[PDB]
Amino acid sequence: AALGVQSINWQTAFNRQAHHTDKFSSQELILRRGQNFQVLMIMNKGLGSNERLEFIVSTGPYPSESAMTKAVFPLSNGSSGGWSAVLQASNGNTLTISISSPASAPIGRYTMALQIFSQGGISSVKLGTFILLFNPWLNVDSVFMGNHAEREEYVQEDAGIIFVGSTNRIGMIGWNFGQFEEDILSICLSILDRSLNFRRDAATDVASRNDPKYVGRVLSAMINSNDDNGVLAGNWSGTYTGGRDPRSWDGSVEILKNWKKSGLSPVRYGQCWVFAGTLNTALRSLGIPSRVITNFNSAHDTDRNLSVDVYYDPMGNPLDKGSDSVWNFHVWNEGWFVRSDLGPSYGGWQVLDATPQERSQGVFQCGPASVIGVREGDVQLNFDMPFIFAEVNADRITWLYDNTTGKQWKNSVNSHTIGRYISTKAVGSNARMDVTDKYKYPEGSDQERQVFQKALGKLKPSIIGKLKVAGMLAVGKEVNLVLLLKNLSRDTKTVTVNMTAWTIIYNGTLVHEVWKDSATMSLDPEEEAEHPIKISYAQYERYLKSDNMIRITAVCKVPDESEVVVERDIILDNPTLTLEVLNEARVRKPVNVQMLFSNPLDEPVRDCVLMVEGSGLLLGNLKIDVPTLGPKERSRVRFDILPSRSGTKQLLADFSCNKFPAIKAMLSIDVAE
Amino acid sequence: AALGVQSINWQTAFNRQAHHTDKFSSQELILRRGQNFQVLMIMNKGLGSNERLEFIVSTGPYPSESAMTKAVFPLSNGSSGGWSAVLQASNGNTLTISISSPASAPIGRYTMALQIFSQGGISSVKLGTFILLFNPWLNVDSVFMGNHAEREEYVQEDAGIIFVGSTNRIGMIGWNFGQFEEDILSICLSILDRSLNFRRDAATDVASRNDPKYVGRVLSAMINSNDDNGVLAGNWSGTYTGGRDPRSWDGSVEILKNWKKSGLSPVRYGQCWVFAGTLNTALRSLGIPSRVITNFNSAHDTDRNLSVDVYYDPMGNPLDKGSDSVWNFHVWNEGWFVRSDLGPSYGGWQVLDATPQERSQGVFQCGPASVIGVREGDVQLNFDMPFIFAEVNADRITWLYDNTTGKQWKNSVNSHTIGRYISTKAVGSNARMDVTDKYKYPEGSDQERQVFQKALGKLKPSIIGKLKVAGMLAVGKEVNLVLLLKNLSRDTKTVTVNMTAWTIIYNGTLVHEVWKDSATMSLDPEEEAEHPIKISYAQYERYLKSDNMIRITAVCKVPDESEVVVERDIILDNPTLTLEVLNEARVRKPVNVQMLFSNPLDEPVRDCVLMVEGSGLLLGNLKIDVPTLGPKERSRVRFDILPSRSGTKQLLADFSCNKFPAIKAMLSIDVAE
Ligand SMILES: CCCCCCCCO[C@@H]1[C@@H](O)[C@H](O)[C@@H](CO)O[C@H]1O
Ligand SMILES: CCCCCCCCO[C@@H]1[C@@H](O)[C@H](O)[C@@H](CO)O[C@H]1O
Ligand SMILES: [Ca+2]
Ligand SMILES: [Ca+2]
Ligand SMILES: [Ca+2]
Numbered sequence A, B: 001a002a003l004g005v006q007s008i009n010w011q012t013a014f015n016r017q018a019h020h021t022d023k024f025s026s027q028e029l030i031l032r033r034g035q036n037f038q039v040l041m042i043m044n045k046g047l048g049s050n051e052r053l054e055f056i057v058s059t060g061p062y063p064s065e066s067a068m069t070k071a072v073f074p075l076s077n078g079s080s081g082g083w084s085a086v087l088q089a090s091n092g093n094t095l096t097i098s099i100s101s102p103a104s105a106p107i108g109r110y111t112m113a114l115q116i117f118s119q120g121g122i123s124s125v126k127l128g129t130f131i132l133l134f135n136p137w138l139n140v141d142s143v144f145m146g147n148h149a150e151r152e153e154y155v156q157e158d159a160g161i162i163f164v165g166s167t168n169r170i171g172m173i174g175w176n177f178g179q180f181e182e183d184i185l186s187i188c189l190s191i192l193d194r195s196l197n198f199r200r201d202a203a204t205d206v207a208s209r210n211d212p213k214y215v216g217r218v219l220s221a222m223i224n225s226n227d228d229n230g231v232l233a234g235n236w237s238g239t240y241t242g243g244r245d246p247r248s249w250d251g252s253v254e255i256l257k258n259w260k261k262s263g264l265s266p267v268r269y270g271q272c273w274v275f276a277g278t279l280n281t282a283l284r285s286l287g288i289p290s291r292v293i294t295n296f297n298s299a300h301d302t303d304r305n306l307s308v309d310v311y312y313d314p315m316g317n318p319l320d321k322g323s324d325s326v327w328n329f330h331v332w333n334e335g336w337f338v339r340s341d342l343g344p345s346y347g348g349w350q351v352l353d354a355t356p357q358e359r360s361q362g363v364f365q366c367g368p369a370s371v372i373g374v375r376e377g378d379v380q381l382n383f384d385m386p387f388i389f390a391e392v393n394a395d396r397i398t399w400l401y402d403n404t405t406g407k408q409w410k411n412s413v414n415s416h417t418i419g420r421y422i423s424t425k426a427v428g429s430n431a432r433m434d435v436t437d438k439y440k441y442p443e444g445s446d447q448e449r450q451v452f453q454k455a456l457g458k459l460k461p462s463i464i465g466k467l468k469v470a471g472m473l474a475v476g477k478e479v480n481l482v483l484l485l486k487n488l489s490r491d492t493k494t495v496t497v498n499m500t501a502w503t504i505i506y507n508g509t510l511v512h513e514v515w516k517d518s519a520t521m522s523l524d525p526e527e528e529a530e531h532p533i534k535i536s537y538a539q540y541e542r543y544l545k546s547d548n549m550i551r552i553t554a555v556c557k558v559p560d561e562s563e564v565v566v567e568r569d570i571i572l573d574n575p576t577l578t579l580e581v582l583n584e585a586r587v588r589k590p591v592n593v594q595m596l597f598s599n600p601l602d603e604p605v606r607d608c609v610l611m612v613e614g615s616g617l618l619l620g621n622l623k624i625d626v627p628t629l630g631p632k633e634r635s636r637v638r639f640d641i642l643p644s645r646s647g648t649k650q651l652l653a654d655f656s657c658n659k660f661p662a663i664k665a666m667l668s669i670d671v672a673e
């Protein structure tokens, strides 16, 4: 009887454990390239001296050996370095075989078949399928990350922290990456089979999947629905009808599953941190060490001159006049891998940004950009460095613009305001890790100025004032500020002060004027004076958005002297939302939790919805409808979670209502077992 | 100045599109009879009311008006049914003329001249030439085929399917008719100027080219080199030195062009499907709807008694005795046209056979034969009905013959074995369409025997055994069969079993004995016995031909009882050969393809040649030399094809080496615009 296969034991638990892929909820054989895995093949008879087994693996719709998307190798001792199979032992008709794959193999879904040469004939049968990912544990793999602690954080951690807020009050929201949640790995993999690149040339695309630079750039494009039926639809208008307020999301899970479930229609809506969290999930799921980065005072230089313009009118009104803009903050990602295309000094963290800001080669894609290169100003290197360098270190010019006279006139230039407190979650904790020094030389140093010039070269008053915050700033309470002015001349001066307050979106989008006022003051030499700014809840509540941001401006003028513009963006805190576990947490053991929220307003809050999730704590997202809550009353909502993986877990919740959209809350929980 | 032509616009693109002749690669004006075409004739002046224009068309070496091979008609309305010219419009000196031809005009190359009567004189000038073909679109043309799908398959399709194999397992080979390839039409037209009929009387020949029955019969003679320096030299010997193995060809293109390239020397070598594929090409190019028919168990009755004899000796050897013979299968063609010579009930499909088996009027020609007439047994009607009727319905007599005693004796008579699974490619797909019901009444039905007698009238054991296949049959593997015997007697019987195994050509030609064995058995009443028949690769490899067929025979004798003859022809499969395109296919876009072949033998295969072709995919035939391939090794050959016509195309390959002649592969490819 001709040689043949009766069955195959993939020893999935054993291999996935050794390959560090055991956390994915999938039942599939998930492996990482460049590392051996062992299988048991039960034949119908003993391997004959004149018989031969040839293993065949292939990925993509057009597998070919020349493209490395297909390999044929014989069961023969020794490793060719690339694909190979070694007969480790024979017991009866069972063959213990060790299979090896090259460190540079394309990632993705593969099929394995067995060609059998026996008795003057040939037979072929499919053995099965498996998934192959990047290997951060393998020294020769481009995504190699040697340190244990870092690799765990940047690859194995599914709970994260993204910094937000403003440079004056940095905050943070929890984010459920959930790369191990059911179907997430599958969906992230399917993204590559849906890109513009794949539709253009599937054979070439699949072959390029052995490159983190290529995979990274594709994802920075596919995470946004722009140009390719990607995942997230961006919206910075303040009005999110037809979707969800970008701030209500708590993780990447619901986003990706909704994308797939909707037949791949855009998920509405997202803003930069949503794009980043989702991209991070994809990157970590595929094996590319990655983290999320927050840059405050992030500039969008559409001019390629490393300079951005902001405008105000004589009355102190901020204007949306230039195509460029400065965001309170912008979030993006960094992937870890060598850069064979740039050289040995440019490996390490690489910037990747799925937020659609600047078109690259016609489409909304961004990165990878060597962070090391950005710091040195080597903006001629791929990819998108001019733009990225601009985000972290463009100069900022303030202009005065009077539409009535059509006259425009330069006021000042700030070369240190843009690119501050660049942050990312610390390894092993929620602390804030400041990586500003990695993106650029110190502000005020001759070096950052030399680099700026270098980068650009490649691409080409009596009155002083200050806005100070007085007392708590929280949605529901009145806003109290103080404009402090001082006369630094030896002559008494008369200053005319025009002020305004506008609610804004975090990127700078102006929503509405909520307050304005003018005043004239008499200041003797050295005299210091102050003008109080009071904005009631009744005045700002109507036009305040989930960003809880307000732009305060004061244009001060003295006869014969240029205007003095005093700026300040303030952020009002949301009332507190709390989560509490009512007992010890143990895996597979139900634990009661309760949400607490007190309405600080004189009116009730309605249409209250509580959204809860957390990988390893709850399967998917829990949605709970909470009844109208009277003024000064408290809502107590109880629900049960069911831990599934022991360790330090993160439970996140969002509480949205008519007067308070997207109030966030997070609770760390230690699950034992 | 006298009236004269300045230039003429044949509006080729427009007229060919209307005449359904736009697919031919030629630059010439190709038209179909009975349909008008439009030309623009720019004269040197206006057409005077006293001037006159006479058009003159002519075809052949002796253009004659009474023979319809020459026609003179005035530029005046009133379509005289046949040739005519109508002045549709006059703009400046440009005359828009519409020319009509008769539905019964002779096909072929025509010259068109113009006679001008101006200013009391006469001038004459040649306008140009055009090609005129049959018109299956014209209701009054004898080749008319009203159904769209059928006409598209039988006239416009250049990719085909020919069924082969045996009654025990019907296979199929792809064939590239290529009627639209460069020079093919021209060559097919030239065949008519090279026939015995043309050389005999060119004047009458060309005049007769208005008759599809005539054109059809001529081609059935000229496709074979016999008697007239025709195209193909047949060879059924198993040895093809000095030419190509009949099974290596993939189409009619290479064949016709070679015929022309060699100064009309015979192309070596062909067998029935090759003659048929080539004839089919000629028929379709000239405009005669046609398809290829495969008849299994095809009989060659040379005695005209509708009976064929097969002989075996006592030792179980098949013998080559008697003029007749029974082919495992035989291929031929059917053309579609009315039969004015036979009557209203005999139109439709007409048998045409270019394979030289039986001379007709001393020439190797065959048909047309009304298929409807064959079914009815109307064998007195032209042409060659006795022979064709016998091919599909002759009775088979099995004889025993011992040359040592010179004695011969009947063993059995079979009236159902001849003419089975008569098949043709389905319209629009590669499915097998069985047309047995068109050639004869049901085997076993009273009618079938009524017609058989009618046709002939116009011309004038205790042991039962079965041969069964044990395991797969493939060139390289051993052959395993079993002779199953059973004694149906009430008394114990002793049976002597003599067996043999002969490699054969598909037509019955005996090549060589590769195995023989004898055994005597004693079987009790109802007892069943089995005798194993095992033939190793070494035993048959030396005598197996490209046909890959072996004839197994068993003559069982019991004292006082007649011999029981058990027969079984088997087909060994060739090792697999596959083609795979590595991307989408689009017009003018080069796309890579890969050939996959694995050597199953313990020895290497040499002289490896890969032949590839396919209309609309490659211009002509691609020839690739493949390096020697060691045992158990795989050959990885890559090459590019260049789609030139959108639609479903057919790629064909032939891989020949010393140990494996003519391995076939076929791949359907969808070419986008
Ligand atoms: C120079 C004095 C002003 C700076 C510190 C003021 C004390 C508290 O700091 C305030 C916070 O309380 C406030 O909610 C946020 C939001 O924008 O802004 C900070 O500057
Ligand atoms: C009675 C035996 C026929 C029943 C089918 C048994 C399964 C395989 O059938 C065999 C094929 O494998 C073989 O290659 C061809 C060639 O002639 O002949 C068939 O009978
Ligand atoms: Ca996109
Ligand atoms: Ca700019
Ligand atoms: Ca700076």
Ligand SMILES: [Ca+2]
Residues within 6 Å of the ligand: B221, B222, B223, B224, B225, B226, B227, B228, B229, B230, B364
């Ligand atoms: Ca001939």
Ligand SMILES: [Ca+2]
Residues within 6 Å of the ligand: B301, B302, B303, B304, B305, B306, B307, B308, B309, B324
């Ligand atoms: Ca006969």
Ligand SMILES: [Ca+2]
Residues within 6 Å of the ligand: B393, B394, B415, B416, B417, B418, B443, B448
């Ligand atoms: Ca019959």
Ligand SMILES: [Cl-]
Residues within 6 Å of the ligand: A026, A181, A182, A183, A184, A185, A186, A187
């Ligand atoms: Cl998954």
Ligand SMILES: [Cl-]
Residues within 6 Å of the ligand: B026, B182, B183, B184, B185, B186, B187
């Ligand atoms: Cl031609």
